Design a protein around this ligand. Structure first.
Ligand code: TRP
Ligand code: TRP
Lengths: 105, 105
DNA sequence: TGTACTCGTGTACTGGTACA
DNA sequence: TGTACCAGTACACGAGTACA
C-alpha cells in the first residue's frame, strides 16, 4: 500500500487542470478554435463533428449500424466503439454530462 | 425541418460550441475529463498535454530545437507541425494564445 | 439474415536524421 | 538553424468481420 498526496479528483497524473483553466478561459468566446490550430493536426473538425455525433445518438439510440455514423460522417467505429466508453468512463462523471443533457436521475 | 444555414445560423457550427460551453462548465473540475476522453479524444489526454505544451513553451522559447521538441514529449513533428499549426489559424486564433501571453491580457 | 464487436491502416504520439 | 520528412511507438480514424 503506497501513500498518496491527499485524494481529491486529480492525482497521480493530474497535469490537466492547469490546461483547462487556459483552454476554457478562451472557450468563453470564439477562442476555443484558436487552440485547434496552433497545434497543426487539431483540424479534428471531423474528429469532433463526427465523434460528438456518436454520443449524440449513443445516449438515444445506441443501436450502431442504423443511422449514419459513417455512411456520410465517421463513427461506425467511433459510435459502436462507444460501447467501450469505459475507456474514458462516462458514468464516472457523465453525472454532470447528463446534467447538461438530461441527468433525469 | 431545415437547419437554416444561410446567414450566420445559430452560433456557427453549434456542434463545436455545444462541446465548448459544456466543457468550460465541467472544465472547472474533473467533469470535463470524462468528456475530453469519452467525447473528444481520450488517448489525447497525452496528446493535448503535449500538443499545447509545445505552443505553451513555443511562446516562451523552448520545447522545440533538435532536443526540446523531444524532451518535451513529442514536439518534433509537433514543434515543426506547430508552424503548420498556423494552418488551422492565420495568426488570428493564435492571437488568443497571446491574449494570455503577450497580445494584451 | 441481422447486428455487435473487433480489427485494419494512417497516423495522433515520440523522436532522429536530412533537407530547405 | 530547425524542422519536415522520415523512423519508432501506439494509438486514432476509419474499416471489416464475427457472432447472435
Ligand atoms: N493534438 C494536436 C497535436 C499536434 C500535432 N502537431 C502539432 C504541432 C504543434 C502542437 C501540437 C500538435 C493536433 O491535433 O494536431
Ligand atoms: N478519440 C476517441 C474518439 C472515439 C473513437 N471511437 C469512439 C467511440 C465512442 C466515443 C468516442 C470515440 C477514441 O479514440 O476513442
Amino acid at each position: 500500500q503506497s501513500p498518496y498526496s491527499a485524494a481529491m479528483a486529480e492525482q497521480r497524473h493530474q497535469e490537466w487542470l492547469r490546461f483547462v483553466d487556459l483552454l476554457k478561459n478562451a472557450y468563453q468566446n470564439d477562442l476555443h478554435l484558436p487552440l485547434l490550430n496552433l497545434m497543426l493536426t487539431p483540424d479534428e473538425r471531423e474528429a469532433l463533428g463526427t465523434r460528438v455525433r456518436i454520443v449524440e445518438e449513443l445516449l438515444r439510440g445506441e443501436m450502431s449500424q442504423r443511422e449514419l455514423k459513417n455512411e456520410l460522417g465517421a463513427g461506425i467505429a467511433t459510435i459502436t466503439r462507444g460501447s467501450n466508453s469505459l475507456k474514458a468512463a462516462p458514468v464516472e462523471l457523465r453525472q454532470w454530462l447528463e446534467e447538461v443533457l438530461l441527468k433525469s436521475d
